[PDB]
Symmetry: C2
């Protein structure tokens, strides 16, 4: 019984912001062994939204949506997370479809781009994405994908 929140960045409280960067750090920095700049600015600007999956005051799912650069290019999905205690069990499919329902609602008549791993390709292709890119590397494999 995960509650979902589709937050424009202006609605984020201090504890809501803390929870999603801490979970982003825990997954993309710590567990994925990648010292990088996870906190890049793109979170509190423009019409950008965040989607949070909560399981009893625990943030167990997250994705952010970039609408930029206030230019022609598509909707960007990124930072897609399920917390490791809860994986292999339909929640990732729930996060994605609700995040596309957000892309669909807010900006219909705009496709959705998404940067991904190579090994995650068949899971995003089950949501309507197709590779728009050659396989390349950020840690030892990425493909660029887009929907509609």
């Amino acid at each position: 019984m995960i509650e979902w929140q589709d937050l424009h960045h202006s609605e984020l409280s201090v504890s809501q912001l803390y929870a999603l960067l801490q979970l982003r750090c825990a997954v993309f920095v710590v567990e994925q062994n990648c010292p990088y700049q996870d906190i890049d600015g793109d979170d509190l600007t423009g019409d950008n939204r965040h989607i949070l999956g909560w399981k009893n005051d625990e943030l167990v799912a997250y994705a952010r949506i970039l609408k930029s650069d206030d230019d022609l290019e598509p909707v960007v999905i990124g930072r897609v997370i399920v917390s490791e205690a809860l994986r292999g069990e339909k929640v990732g499919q729930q996060l994605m479809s609700k995040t596309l329902e957000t892309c669909t609602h807010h900006w219909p008549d705009k496709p959705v781009y998404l940067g991904a791993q190579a090994h995650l390709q068949n899971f995003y292709q089950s949501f309507g994405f197709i590779p728009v890119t050659e396989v390349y590397e950020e840690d030892g494999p990425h493909i660029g994908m887009a929907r509609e």
Copy 2:
């Protein structure tokens, strides 16, 4: 150089993003360490954050943790643009003045390394620990 001294309840959404952003930019990308900087110590108890501002850009940072056990200093940062000229010595000057004000006659502990030993030692800190590696030579000093 505007300085702020905020109990964690006074952090706005923008002040919270900025100090984590600089902390990630110093302790994880620059020092090449993939650790959990956002560690759950920032928004609890009487813990406070000391900020130094210059043109809508956080350039000096330190953190103060509470709880029967001593007051702790950590996360000490001078952004690279401003390093090497007096910004660090005076950050911990607010930061020890801040301890001395809320917790008067209460001993400051500072987790540090070693290379900068003489730096922190210039403010009253004393080795309490033996050197060990962490995430990287370390030592735990203390003041008063």
